[PDB]
Each structure stands twice: as structure tokens, then as C-alpha cells.
Amino acid sequence: HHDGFQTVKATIDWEHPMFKLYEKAKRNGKWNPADIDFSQDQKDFASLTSEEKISALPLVAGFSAGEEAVTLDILPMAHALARQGRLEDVLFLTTFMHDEAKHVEMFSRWQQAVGIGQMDLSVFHNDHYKRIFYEALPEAMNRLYADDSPEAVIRAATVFNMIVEGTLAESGYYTFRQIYKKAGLFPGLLQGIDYLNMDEGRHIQFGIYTIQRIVNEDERYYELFIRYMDELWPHVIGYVDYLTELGKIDYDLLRHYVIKQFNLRKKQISRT
Amino acid sequence: HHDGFQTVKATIDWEHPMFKLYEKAKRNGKWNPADIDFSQDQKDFASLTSEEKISALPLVAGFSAGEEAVTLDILPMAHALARQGRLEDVLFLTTFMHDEAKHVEMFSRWQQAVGIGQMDLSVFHNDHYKRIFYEALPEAMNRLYADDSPEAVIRAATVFNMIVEGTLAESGYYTFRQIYKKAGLFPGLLQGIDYLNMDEGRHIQFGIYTIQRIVNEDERYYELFIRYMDELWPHVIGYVDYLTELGKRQQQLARTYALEIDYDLLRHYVIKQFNLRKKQISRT
Ligand SMILES: CCCCCCCCCCCCCCCC(=O)O
Ligand SMILES: CCCCCCCCCCCCCCCC(=O)O
Ligand SMILES: [Fe+2]
Ligand SMILES: [Fe+2]
Ligand SMILES: [Fe+2]
Ligand SMILES: [Fe+2]
Ligand SMILES: [Mn+2]
Ligand SMILES: [Mn+2]
Incomplete structure (x- = not known):
């Protein structure tokens, strides 16, 4: 049951950080994947x-599945924060979820346009990828339906925002630009990546805000954050190693970029 | 756990009616409540x-709480359809949810701009309003977390899309125009209402599609739909009667602005909306 409604008893908290992020998302998140010309990509x-075609597919396979997973798996976080009365967080998360819908759409439109929509790309998801995207991510998010404790929320935001988005996805955009911008290939996909990267900046800000506001209640949660980050590292690097070996472009450059992102995300949360 | 992913094994179903509705939502849902000029409304x-100021508040109280309720209460439907693998429905529902965020924001910005943000407008929710929005709506939607049966989904879409959006809100837009557009008042609120009304056409279409596809599986569910519509009517009309009674006790805004407010034409618009929504679902 609803006890009452914040915008009847009072108003939106206009100064709330997540309301301000919501406002930015509306002003900056206007792109439509349907407007991207993929004809040159085809x-x-x-x-x-045939060999070069195959080389491009593992990264696309990782992105399409990843965007689809985050579209579905943000819903428990929206529910948990709604149930906590965090209205401004919920408003922001409507833009987060619509951004992910566009991301899923973009990669699927690319696959369709270039002629691989009929190909099952699941063959490029190894065990480490599945441990993150088929298992750990939905487990951590769905937990929030029955357990919205600080520990549960930190774990959810760590897996979703700091690992999936802040480490793997961030490193994926970089990789795609290092390879395909340089090769002069797939201008429509690269345009899509540029819009997506802008959206995802907001998503990581939500993850940082969420983790830090819980850590601010108790430094014991800081140590939880670091532990959950380290828990997932073997799967992050296990997936990276798998793509690197398929690749056979400076792969050690890309590998160190992943490590750089992982340590960067850790440093964006302060014990204090 | 995820078994696999549709856009890895295949693609989005580009011809799916909810993918087409999602595409329309992106094209047509561009407005931003933050861009509406409320200075004249202030x-x-x-x-x-004071006695004219009061006249507008019961309707605004109904919409602000309604929009906040639907913002929160669509989440279980999105979850249930996601768990069923209905990806195109989920994509569309991201636009539904972001629409509702804008609707909550719009009415809250109006309240802030005109100087009533600090006033508790809950006093204009009567018992019938509360049974719909504080109780029946969240109960029917939350049910979907543990029961996504056809019966549960039809009931959820009936309460949310056909009654709350398709009967009450639709009648509220009409009432607002019948009163304040003729008066020449609140141009920013009216601009917001117009944008909102456009969004809500898609929301009702989602409800029709959802109910109809379930009725198509088994015509027995058509009688469930009719029954659930009829179960809620006493609270629809109980709330309408309450707002009518308030409006008839304060007629200064209508006197001042020479509006022959026909509450009996509004009441008949509510009845028309209710019966019209029923006709939009067919047995076969
Ligand atoms: C060889 C260098 C390895 C680079 C790492 C590539 C990782 C693929 C990215 C897939 C994850 C996508 C997750 C979506 C998250 C979001 O968009 O919010
Ligand atoms: C005197 C005539 C009565 C007219 C009826 C007024 C009803 C007020 C509307 C409040 C419901 C708003 C629900 C929002 C649903 C949505 O936008 O998705
Ligand atoms: Fe994201
Ligand atoms: Fe391994
Ligand atoms: Fe709606
Ligand atoms: Fe009554
Ligand atoms: Mn994304
Ligand atoms: Mn609405």
C-alpha cells in the first residue's frame, strides 16, 4: 500500500543529486538509434x-548480451529504491533504463544491418563471461526484491555499475575505438558507441552516489565494496584474456586499460 | 539466471507491436517539463x-498522487514481462516509465511555481480515491512478483491502464480543458496536460495490447476483464461524485469566469470513457 505521496504532501526534492542527474539525462540523452545510418557498416x-568478420563478433556478442542484461537487471534496483521512498533516484533510473533500451536496440540494429542477426553469437561467451552476466549480475540485482540491506545494495551497485559498466563496458568502448576508428570501419556503430559512452557516464555517477552514501554510514561497508570488486576481478580478467587470445592492435595496451578502469573505480569510492 | 539473450541468439523482433510503440514513443515523447514556462500560471x-484558488486543487491533488503512483507501480509489470522474455514489451515500458517520471515532475513543478508546494493536498483524496490509488493499484501490480498468471496480468492492466489511465486520467484531462482552457488560465499547466495526454495514448495502447493478447489465448479471460472493470466502477464514480460535490460547493471560479461548468456532462464523459475502454477489448 502507498502511505501517501511525496508530490502531494510536498514536492520533488529539487536539489537532490539524483534529481540533478535526471535533469542532465533529459537534456543530454536525446539520441535515437533508429536515426543511425548503418548502410556503410554493412x-x-x-x-x-571471413576471418576478419569473425574477429569482430566476440566484442559485439559481449556488448549485445551485456546491454540486454542491464536493461532487465536494473528493475530490482528501481524497485528497491522506490520502496525506500527515494523518489528522485527512481526518476533518474527511468532515464537509466531507457538509455539501456537504446543501447540494446543499437547493437541489435547493427547486427541486423550487417547481416549477422540470424547468427547465434552466444558461442563467444566463455565461462567467465557467463559467471558475470548470466549469473552474478542477475543474482545480485534480484536479491534486492527480498533483501534491500546496505550490504545487498552495495553489492548490487558494485557488480552492476562498477564492474559491468565501469570496468568491462568502459574498456569495451575504448577497445572498439582503438581498433575500428583506426581501421576506418563501422562509422555507424562508432557513432552509436559515442552516444552510449555519454549516457554511461551518468550511470556510473549513480553507482558512485549509491555506494558512497551507504559507505558514509559505516566504514565497514567500504571494505565490503573492495572485497566484492576483488571477488569479480578473476572473471573480468578471465573474459579479457579470452578475447585477447581470440584476437590472435596492441592487446597489452587494452589489457592494461581494463586494469586501469578497475583500479579507477575503486578509487572513486572513499573510505571516509 | 539468464538462459541466454535474444539479441545474441537473434535480434529484436522488429515487427512486434510493442517495438513499434517503443519507436513511436521515442519519436513523439521529446518534451521536457523543465522547459515549460509557468510564470503566467504563478x-x-x-x-x-482564496475561494477560486481552492477550486483547482482537488484535481491537481488527484493527478499528482496518480502520476507518482503509476511511476512506482509500473515496475512490477516490467519485471513480470521481462521474466517472461518479452523483450520488446520491456523496451516499450522504459518509455512508459520515463513518461510517468515527466508527468510526476510536471505537476510538482506547477505546485512549486504557483506557491502550494508546501501545502499538503492529501485532504482531497477521499475513501474511494484511496481504495484505487493507495490500495487496489499497488496490490494488483505487486501481485505480479509472485503470480504472473494470465488472470493476474489482466487484472493489473485493467486497474492500471483501463481504469486509472483510460477512465480516470482521460476524464481528468477533459475536465481540465473544459474548465481552465475556457477560462484562459494556467497556460503552462495546460501545455503540460497536452503533452501528457499524448504520452498516455501509448500507455492505454499497451494496456489494450496486453489484455487482448491474453484474451486471444483463452476467451474466458474476456469475462474476467469485464468483471474487474465493473468491480472498480463504484470507486471511479465515488471519486467523481466527490469532486463534483466539491466543485458545486465552490462555484466562484465558474461564476467569475462565466463557465457553465456542466458536471453532468463531465460525469457522462467518465461513463463514456469506461464503456469505451470495454469496447476496445473483444472476445475473439
Ligand atoms: C581485449 C580488451 C578487452 C575489453 C573488454 C570488452 C568487454 C565487452 C563489454 C560488454 C559489457 C557491456 C555491459 C553493459 C553495461 C551498460 O551498458 O550499462
Ligand atoms: C468532475 C469530473 C471528474 C474527472 C475525473 C478526475 C480524475 C483525476 C485524475 C487522477 C488520475 C491520474 C492517474 C495518472 C495515470 C497516468 O498518467 O499514467
Ligand atoms: Fe549503463
Ligand atoms: Fe578461466
Ligand atoms: Fe500512464
Ligand atoms: Fe462513498
Ligand atoms: Mn548501456
Ligand atoms: Mn502519466
Whole structure:
């Protein structure tokens, strides 16, 4: 049951950080994947040899599944914060979820346009990828339906925002630009990546805000955050190692970028 | 756990009716409540007598709570359809949810701008209003976390889309225009209402699609739909009667602005909306 409503008893908290992020999301998140011209991407893909075609698919497989997972798996966080009365967080999260919908749409439109929509790309998800995206991510989010404790919320935001988005996805954009911008390939996909990267800046800000406001209640939660980050590292690097070996471009450059992002995300939360 | 992912094994179903509705939502849902000029609304509200100021508040109280309720209460539907693998429905529902956020924001910005943000408007929710919005709506939606049966989904879409949006809110837009557009008052609120009404057409279409696809599986569910509509009517009309009674006890705004407010035409619009929603679902 609803006890009452914040915008009847009072108003939105106009100064709340998540209301301010919501306002930014509306002003900056206007792109439509349906407007991207993928016609040259189709011709670029056809120009590749069979071996070069295969080389591009593991990264796309990781992104399509990843965007689909985050579209579905943010819903428990929205529910948990709604149940806690965090209205401004909920408003922001409507933009987060609509951003992810666009991300899923974008990669799927690319697959369709280049002629691989009919190909099952699941073959490029190894055990480490599945441990994160098929298992750990939905487990941590769904937990929030029955357990919205600080510990549960930190774990959810750690897996979702700091690892999935802040480590793997961030490193994926970089990788795609290092390879394909340089090769002059897939301009429509790279335009989509640029819009997506802008959206995801907001998503990471929500994760940092959420983790830090809980850590501020108790430094014991800081140690939980670091432990959950380290818990998932073997799977992050296990997936990275798998893509790197498929790749055979400076792969050690890309690998160190992943490590850089992982340590960066840790440093964006303060014990204090 | 996720078994796999549709956009890895295949693609989005580009022809799915809810993918098409999602596409329309992106194209047509561009407005931003933060861009509405409420400065004239502020002046209008201040120029009103206390007894004219009051006349508008019961309707605004109904919409602010309603929009906040639907913002929160759509989440279980999105979850239930997601768990069923209905990806295109989920994509569309992201636009539904972000629409509702804008609707909550819009009415809250109006209240803030006109100087009533600090006033507790709960006093204009009677028992019938509370049975719909404080109780029946969240109960029917939350049910979906543990019971996503066809019966549960039809009941959820009936309460949310056909009654709350398709009968009450639709009648509220009409009432607001019948009163304040003719008066020449609250231009920013009216702009917001117009944007909102456009969004809500899609929300009702989602409800029709959802109910109809379940009725298509088994025509027995059509009688469930009709029954659930009829179960809620006493509270729809109980709330309408309450707002009508309030409006008839304060007629200064109508006298001042020469509006022959026909509450019996509004009451008949509510009845028309209710019966019209029923006709939009067919047995076969
Ligand atoms: C060889 C260098 C490895 C680079 C790492 C590539 C990782 C693939 C990215 C897939 C994760 C996508 C998750 C979506 C998160 C979001 O968009 O919010
Ligand atoms: C005197 C005529 C009575 C007219 C009825 C007024 C009803 C007020 C509307 C409040 C419900 C708002 C619910 C929001 C639903 C949505 O926008 O999705
Ligand atoms: Fe994201
Ligand atoms: Fe391994
Ligand atoms: Fe709606
Ligand atoms: Fe009554
Ligand atoms: Mn994304
Ligand atoms: Mn609405």
C-alpha cells in the first residue's frame, strides 16, 4: 500500500543529486538509434574476409548480451529504491533504463544491418563471461526484491555499475575505438558507441552516489565494496584474456586499460 | 539466471507491436517539463481569490498522487514481462516509465511555481480515491512478483491502464480543458496536460495490447476483464461524485469566469470513457 505521496504532501526534492542527474539525462540523452545510418557498416562488413568478420563478433556478442542484461537487471534496483521512498533516484533510473533500451536496440540494429542477426553469437561467451552476466549480475540485482540491506545494495551497485559498466563496458568502448576508428570501419556503430559512452557516464555517477552514501554510514561497508570488486576481478580478467587470445592492435595496451578502469573505480569510492 | 539473450541468439523482433510503440514513443515523447514556462500560471494563481484558488486543487491533488503512483507501480509489470522474455514489451515500458517520471515532475513543478508546494493536498483524496490509488493499484501490480498468471496480468492492466489511465486520467484531462482552457488560465499547466495526454495514448495502447493478447489465448479471460472493470466502477464514480460535490460547493471560479461548468456532462464523459475502454477489448 502507498502511505501517501511525496508530490502531494510536498514536492520533488529539487536539489537532490539524483534529481540533478535526471535533469542532465533529459537534456543530454536525446539520441535515437533508429536515426543511425548503418548502410556503410554493412558494406564495410562485407568487404572483410571471413576471418576478419569473425574477429569482430566476440566484442559485439559481449556488448549485445551485456546491454540486454542491464536493461532487465536494473528493475530490482528501481524497485528497491522506490520502496525506500527515494523518489528522485527512481526518476533518474527511468532515464537509466531507457538509455539501456537504446543501447540494446543499437547493437541489435547493427547486427541486423550487417547481416549477422540470424547468427547465434552466444558461442563467444566463455565461462567467465557467463559467471558475470548470466549469473552474478542477475543474482545480485534480484536479491534486492527480498533483501534491500546496505550490504545487498552495495553489492548490487558494485557488480552492476562498477564492474559491468565501469570496468568491462568502459574498456569495451575504448577497445572498439582503438581498433575500428583506426581501421576506418563501422562509422555507424562508432557513432552509436559515442552516444552510449555519454549516457554511461551518468550511470556510473549513480553507482558512485549509491555506494558512497551507504559507505558514509559505516566504514565497514567500504571494505565490503573492495572485497566484492576483488571477488569479480578473476572473471573480468578471465573474459579479457579470452578475447585477447581470440584476437590472435596492441592487446597489452587494452589489457592494461581494463586494469586501469578497475583500479579507477575503486578509487572513486572513499573510505571516509 | 539468464538462459541466454535474444539479441545474441537473434535480434529484436522488429515487427512486434510493442517495438513499434517503443519507436513511436521515442519519436513523439521529446518534451521536457523543465522547459515549460509557468510564470503566467504563478500570476494567474495569485490573482485568484482564496475561494477560486481552492477550486483547482482537488484535481491537481488527484493527478499528482496518480502520476507518482503509476511511476512506482509500473515496475512490477516490467519485471513480470521481462521474466517472461518479452523483450520488446520491456523496451516499450522504459518509455512508459520515463513518461510517468515527466508527468510526476510536471505537476510538482506547477505546485512549486504557483506557491502550494508546501501545502499538503492529501485532504482531497477521499475513501474511494484511496481504495484505487493507495490500495487496489499497488496490490494488483505487486501481485505480479509472485503470480504472473494470465488472470493476474489482466487484472493489473485493467486497474492500471483501463481504469486509472483510460477512465480516470482521460476524464481528468477533459475536465481540465473544459474548465481552465475556457477560462484562459494556467497556460503552462495546460501545455503540460497536452503533452501528457499524448504520452498516455501509448500507455492505454499497451494496456489494450496486453489484455487482448491474453484474451486471444483463452476467451474466458474476456469475462474476467469485464468483471474487474465493473468491480472498480463504484470507486471511479465515488471519486467523481466527490469532486463534483466539491466543485458545486465552490462555484466562484465558474461564476467569475462565466463557465457553465456542466458536471453532468463531465460525469457522462467518465461513463463514456469506461464503456469505451470495454469496447476496445473483444472476445475473439
Ligand atoms: C581485449 C580488451 C578487452 C575489453 C573488454 C570488452 C568487454 C565487452 C563489454 C560488454 C559489457 C557491456 C555491459 C553493459 C553495461 C551498460 O551498458 O550499462
Ligand atoms: C468532475 C469530473 C471528474 C474527472 C475525473 C478526475 C480524475 C483525476 C485524475 C487522477 C488520475 C491520474 C492517474 C495518472 C495515470 C497516468 O498518467 O499514467
Ligand atoms: Fe549503463
Ligand atoms: Fe578461466
Ligand atoms: Fe500512464
Ligand atoms: Fe462513498
Ligand atoms: Mn548501456
Ligand atoms: Mn502519466
